[PDB]
Design a protein around this ligand. Structure first.
Ligand code: ADP
Ligand code: ADP
Ligand code: ADP
Lengths: 88, 712, 474
């Protein structure tokens, strides 16, 4: 919904991610970081009628991922990737 | 299809362009998606697309940095091709351009490139040139290597490298520090007028070679020095690509007879060879002063040579001549005949909004402290022009530089980028510079949109509607082009004229008694034509002639000398009014306190056909007046404004204001004395009532009512 | 041309001017045209330079040399006949002059027709409508409009057919027509180069355009036509024809139409002089321009010279207050002098108008000046109906429109106000007509709606002032 809250977008992404529990941030197209716990609507933060967000893992877990030598080569769950569509 | 006309940017950022949403829906790209732009000479650039409420459906808004990378100019067309396949980069090698890195040293990455790209996720393509501002310098960089190709998005995990000598600028590349449209603050309307007249024959010369009708040959820009007359001429030439030739009076007049005229006509010949071109002649009044005011042969012959060169423009295709003067009446009138310089644009003096924008332009490269408020500065810099605001910023910078440089202690040929990056200009440095700066246009008339709105005027609800109808009717549906106000003084005559100008966002030109008297006394009533010319150039505007009877009173009023109701100035005003059309967007308002002795000519059909009576306010209006006057101050709950209004039965709006200001003055006294209370109390109003009196007697009201009944 | 000769060095300007005259004799018969005469030979008493005084003397003697240079006629052009050294206009030299001025409403149409000779115009093109809209335009501007309209038609059609080349097929050229939209576009791009200068023309106003005032129409014919249609009766009875008439009364009653209508039937030029012109002359100490006005009438003859706002001089002297003297002043003194020196044999008739007759300098009403007085009151019941019907001659009127009722209600309305009512009702009927396709006649609803905006321009006290004055004169 154009009036949906930012917390519903974080919930949507968490369900799509391979690891729904792993903290992350979503950066809006205007350079403003979106806070999951902020009561702000999509039509108020400039994500209507359509927008692209930039995904990045929280800095705390990125330090552990790099220090452990783990390549973050999969973001989404195989349950969604098995249905991936190509763009033309 | 999928191609839009290039227009000016609203968002100054160098990595983004703005489309109208319907075209993003046709291209099926979202806000923030990365797209490629296809420009001329088989070049392309990568950027992010957003949308706004101002972009035209068929245009793309992009700034100078993006246009230069595409080798396109305003008015051209480019293709938009979304490229969602763009990946994040791994390593990008960026090197500065030598033309902008001179005199500066230190670690350019830490100061410029790092904060520019950090968490910005800007698209980058090999060969791009982009600008990073800071440290009071504008430094642009060129991308020479990208690990992915030919473009990518920078990420926090992308390696940013910068090693090697600065790159020498190529001959096909333009400097981003050259004056363009984004360097002009106020006077946007005047710039738009130049665009309509000039850009078409320069961008599309093939439209005028096929026809016998020539575009305007000369444009005369006039106004005080330091307002941007030369800046506009240069910005237009640089944005369209026309060759810019600079001429000025002193350069030609300093030469001897023969050499002087040769140089003037040689410049015109060079413009033809380099056409399309713009010839800018500064100090036109110096190169071509009125011939009847000089007896020298050099001055008279140069005027004749310039006149013939202007006529020769019918052969010098695509050459446009622009000239700058202080006033259109300071030059030989021959230049202003049909053809030659028959188009005039008044640049004027920037208002509070324009001054703020000019300051923001000059601070593009400046680091400001958190306490800096340029809007406050723009409000204090009354009478300043852009040249003075440029000096203001420079002087504030120099004061900040001295304060920190005494601690930096870096004595060398170059200055480290880091120590400049930490330098910030604070409010104490702007206020210091304001105290040292002296405006160059303080005595010139300042014309701007007034700040008085309808909520500042108590009562007169029907007059407010009448004025809104008089201005709205000729636009929504012979309509009248002016109104006279009459009635007791201090009831809001001037405020009404300002408030309608405010709501319309129209310029308010105030003509007061002393100005009408000065013109009469000095036999300089010809200045009325300049006043009306200002009103036309300032359109939309409200031209307010206060104290229309000030001269009749100066000549005796009730007694009289050699004259009566009409005088030098009012007759010149009548002369101009009879030539003004309702389509000029100029609304003329008059006011008088003695309508019984005002030249009846002004009320004849076709002139000030509307006539509104402004009586003393009634009881509910007096309360509204007190509330409006006190809207800017804390007022105690014990203050009974209705009780005061009931007592002040014969008081005008001006008289109620005196009461409010008297109560305020007392509040100031008590506050200071107690500190050595925080709101105005009833005791302050009760004391004010002991001194305030009505300024208009009952006999004077009858005089106004009798007139009102006579005319209906 | 002036500025080219003046751009030369001392000695070169005089030699070049002499050569042109010598070449004309060798190539006689020949015409020498000197443009911007005021630039090559400005008034000597208005310049300072030796070279400029020398050039004027050189031209003056070259003009006299034309008695020996057989079959050489010199023509010159200036913007103002009094901006050149008066010696040039002395007997011999430039002893003839012709005032070209600005093309009139008919001439503007003629110019548009001339510059469209080769153009194929569409059925929707109306050059008369353009000529009426192009107020303040001169031939240079009207020619631009025609060329621009032609180019717009070319860019719409030919640029979708042909290449950027030198040659176009004859069939494609002849297949191209210029529409009214192309002329209107050019009109929006052009700007009149002569909007402030006075335009003198034979008016198109006829007697059928004036409602009421039947007796004034006849009186003007007796004053203007009879002195020249029946001169043998004026001589027989020793009558001295009047040189002019002054109109007075409330504004908007047809004073302007009266002067134009008699000029129309007489096929005479109408010259419009307004108050601001007389006011400027006084305050600027340039009353010499009074002679220019009367000389325009002498050169435009037959003509009717109309002085509006004749009270402007009396008002400038104070009007309602003023000093303890009379109305005589510099400008009116020059006006009276020029009138007295004007002969009735030049077929020039002077008409004045004022809205404040009580302050008109009595000198203007003496025999030989504007001795005749005609009162033009607000139209009466039968005249107001005539005015409404006259304005509606251009648009069908529905049977439900009661024009006599409106005339009986609009008792305080002037002819100017009745015209707004008719024209507004016409616009309202047109608005409905256009909307019906997104009507054939003006309906009662359009007149009743028009009455919501129309107002009387003349107050009740103004009427009594005019009636009391007219009664005072008996
Ligand atoms: N309207 C304006 N907007 C922005 N800057 C302006 C404006 N007017 C003047 N300036 C600034 O003031 C200076 C003008 O100096 P100059 O180039 O001599 O032009 P001019 O004296 O004709 O105004 C420049 O630094 C310019 O940036
Ligand atoms: N209707 C009104 N409402 C509020 N304040 C008024 C009103 N009329 C007059 N004033 C006060 O009187 C002062 C002068 O008003 P102004 O319009 O300048 O008078 P004038 O037009 O006679 O010069 C203003 O500062 C205002 O505070
Ligand atoms: N008697 C009349 N018959 C028809 N129309 C009239 C009459 N009187 C005035 N008008 C209209 O009023 C307008 C103004 O007339 P005019 O004589 O110019 O007024 P004034 O010169 O006093 O301002 C004219 O355009 C005309 O259409």
């Amino acid at each position: 919904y154009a009036r949906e809250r930012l917390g519903a977008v974080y919930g949507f992404v968490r369900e799509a991610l391979q690891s729904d529990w792993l903290p992350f941030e979503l950066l809006a197209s205007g350079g403003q970081k979106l806070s999951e716990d902020e009561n702000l609507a999509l039509n108020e933060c400039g994500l209507v009628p359509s927008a692209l967000l930039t995904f990045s893992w929280d800095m705390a877990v990125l330090e552990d991922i790099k220090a452990a030598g783990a390549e973050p080569d999969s973001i989404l769950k195989p349950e969604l990737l098995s249905a991936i569509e190509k763009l033309l | 299809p999928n191609r839009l006309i290039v227009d000016e940017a609203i968002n100054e950022d160098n990595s983004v362009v703005s489309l109208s949403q319907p075209k993003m829906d046709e291209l099926q790209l979202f806000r923030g998606d990365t797209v490629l732009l296809k420009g001329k000479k088989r070049r392309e650039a990568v950027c992010i697309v957003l949308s706004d409420d101002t972009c035209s459906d068929e245009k793309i808004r992009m700034n100078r940095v993006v246009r230069n990378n595409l080798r396109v100019r305003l008015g051209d067309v480019i293709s938009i091709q979304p490229c969602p396949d763009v990946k994040y980069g791994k390593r990008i090698h960026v090197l500065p351009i030598d033309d902008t890195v001179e005199g500066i040293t230190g670690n350019l990455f830490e100061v410029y490139l790092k904060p520019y790209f950090l968490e910005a996720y800007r698209p980058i393509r090999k060969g791009d040139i982009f600008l990073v501002r800071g440290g009071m310098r504008a430094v642009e960089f060129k991308v020479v290597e990208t690990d992915p190709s030919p473009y990518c998005i920078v990420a926090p995990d992308t390696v940013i490298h910068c090693e090697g000598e600065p790159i020498k600028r190529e001959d096909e590349e333009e400097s981003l520090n050259e004056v363009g449209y984004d360097d002009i603050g106020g006077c946007r309307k005047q710039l738009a007028q130049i665009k309509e007249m000039v850009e078409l024959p320069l961008r599309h010369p093939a439209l005028f070679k096929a026809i016998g009708v020539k575009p305007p040959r000369g444009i005369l820009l006039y106004g005080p020095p330091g307002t941007g007359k030369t800046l506009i001429a240069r910005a237009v030439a640089n944005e369209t690509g026309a060759f810019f030739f600079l001429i000025n009076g002193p350069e030609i007049m300093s030469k001897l007879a023969g050499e002087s005229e040769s140089n003037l006509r040689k410049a015109f010949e060079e413009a033809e060879k380099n056409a399309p071109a713009i010839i800018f002649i500064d100090e036109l009044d110096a190169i071509a002063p009125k011939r009847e005011k000089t007896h020298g042969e050099v001055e008279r012959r140069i005027v004749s040579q310039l006149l013939t060169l202007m006529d020769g423009l019918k052969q010098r295709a695509h050459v446009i001549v622009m000239a700058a003067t202080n006033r259109p009446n300071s030059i030989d009138p021959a230049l202003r005949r049909f053809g030659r310089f028959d188009r005039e644009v008044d640049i004027g003096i920037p208002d509070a909004t324009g001054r703020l924008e000019i300051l923001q332009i000059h601070t593009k490269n400046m680091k400001l402290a958190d306490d800096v408020d340029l809007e406050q500065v723009a409000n204090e810099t009354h009478g300043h022009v852009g040249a003075d605001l440029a000096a203001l910023c420079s002087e504030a910078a120099l004061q900040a530089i001295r304060k920190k440089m005494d601690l930096i202690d870096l004595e060398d040929e170059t200055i480290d980028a880091e120590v400049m990056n930490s330098l910030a200009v604070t409010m104490d440095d702007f206020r210091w510079a304001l105290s040292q700066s002296n405006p160059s246009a303080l005595r010139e008339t300042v014309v701007e949109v007034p700040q008085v709105t309808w909520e500042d005027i108590g009562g007169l609800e029907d007059v407010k509607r009448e004025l809104q109808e008089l201005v709205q009717y000729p636009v929504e549906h012979t309509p009248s082009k002016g109104v006279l106000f009459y009635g007791p003084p201090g009831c809001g005559k001037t405020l009404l004229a300002k408030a309608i100008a405010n709501e319309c966002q129209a310029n308010f030109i105030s003509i007061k008694g002393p100005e009408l008297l000065t013109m009469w006394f000095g036999e300089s009533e010809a200045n009325v034509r300049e006043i009306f010319d200002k009103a036309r150039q300032a359109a939309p505007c409200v031209l307010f002639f206060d104290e229309l009877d000030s001269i009749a009173k100066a000549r005796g009023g009730n007694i009289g000398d050699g004259g009566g109701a009409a005088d030098r100035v009012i007759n010149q005003i009548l002369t101009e009014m009879d030539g003004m059309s309702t389509k000029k967007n100029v609304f003329i308002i008059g006011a008088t306190n003695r309508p019984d002795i005002i030249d009846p000519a002004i009320l004849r059909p076709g002139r000030l056909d509307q006539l509104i009576y402004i009586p003393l306010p009634d009881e509910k209006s007096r309360v509204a007046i007190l509330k409006a006057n006190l809207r800017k101050s804390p007022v105690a709950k014990d203050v009974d404004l209705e009780f005061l209004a009931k007592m002040t039965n014969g008081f005008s709006g001006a008289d109620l204001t005196e009461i409010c200001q008297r109560a305020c003055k007392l509040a100031i006294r008590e506050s200071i004395e107690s500190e050595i209370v925080p709101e105005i109390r009833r005791d302050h109003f009760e004391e004010a009532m002991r001194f305030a009196r009505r300024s208009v007697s009952d006999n004077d009201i009858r005089k106004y009512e009798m007139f009102a009944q006579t005319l209906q | 041309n002036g500025p080219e000769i003046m751009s030369k060095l001392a000695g070169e300007s005089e030699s070049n001017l002499r050569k042109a005259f010598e070449e004309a004799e060798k190539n006689a018969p020949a015409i020498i045209f000197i443009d911007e005469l005021d630039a090559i030979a400005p008034k000597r008493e208005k310049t300072h330079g030796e070279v400029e005084r020398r050039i004027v003397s050189q031209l003056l003697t070259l003009m006299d040399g034309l008695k020996q240079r057989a079959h050489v006629i010199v023509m010159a052009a200036t913007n103002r006949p009094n901006s050149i050294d008066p010696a040039l206009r002395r007997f011999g030299r430039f002893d003839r002059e012709v005032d070209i001025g600005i093309p009139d409403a008919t001439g503007r149409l003629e110019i548009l027709q001339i510059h469209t000779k080769n153009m194929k115009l569409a059925d929707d093109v109306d050059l008369e409508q353009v000529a009426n809209e192009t107020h303040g335009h001169v031939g240079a501007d009207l020619a631009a409009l025609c060329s621009e309209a032609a180019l717009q038609a070319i860019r719409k059609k030919m640029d979708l057919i042909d290449l950027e080349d030198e040659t176009i097929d004859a069939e494609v050229m002849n297949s191209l027509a210029v529409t009214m939209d192309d002329f209107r576009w050019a009109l929006s791009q052009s700007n009149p180069s002569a909007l402030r200068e006075t335009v003198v023309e034979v008016p198109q106003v006829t007697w059928e355009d004036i409602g009421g005032l039947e007796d004034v129409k006849r009186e003007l014919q007796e004053l203007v036509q009879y002195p020249v249609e029946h001169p043998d009766k004026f001589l027989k009875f020793g009558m001295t024809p009047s040189k002019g008439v002054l109109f007075y009364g409330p504004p908007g009653c047809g004073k302007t139409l009266l002067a134009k209508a008699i000029a129309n039937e007489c096929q005479a030029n109408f010259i419009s002089i307004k108050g601001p012109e007389l006011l400027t002359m006084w305050f600027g100490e340039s009353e010499a321009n009074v002679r220019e006005i009367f000389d325009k009438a002498r050169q435009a003859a037959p003509c009717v010279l109309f002085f509006d706002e004749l009270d402007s001089i009396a008002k400038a002297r104070g009007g309602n207050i003023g000093d303890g003297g009379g109305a005589a002043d510099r400008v009116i003194n020059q006006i009276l002098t020029e009138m007295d020196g004007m002969s009735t044999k030049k077929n020039v008739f002077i008409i004045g108008a004022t809205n404040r007759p009580d302050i008109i300098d009595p000198a203007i009403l003496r025999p030989g000046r504007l001795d005749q007085l005609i009162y033009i009151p607000l139209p009466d019941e039968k005249s107001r109906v005539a005015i409404l019907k006259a304005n509606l001659r251009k648009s069908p009127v529905a049977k439900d429109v009661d024009l006599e009722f409106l005339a009986k209600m609009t008792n305080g309305f002037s002819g100017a106000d009745l015209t707004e009512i008719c024209q507004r009702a016409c616009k309202l009927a047109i608005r409905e007509s256009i909307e019906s396709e997104i009507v054939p006649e003006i309906r009662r609803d359009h007149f009743e709606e028009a009455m919501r905006f129309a107002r009387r321009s003349v107050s009740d006290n103004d009427i009594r002032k005019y009636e009391m004055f007219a009664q005072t004169l008996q």
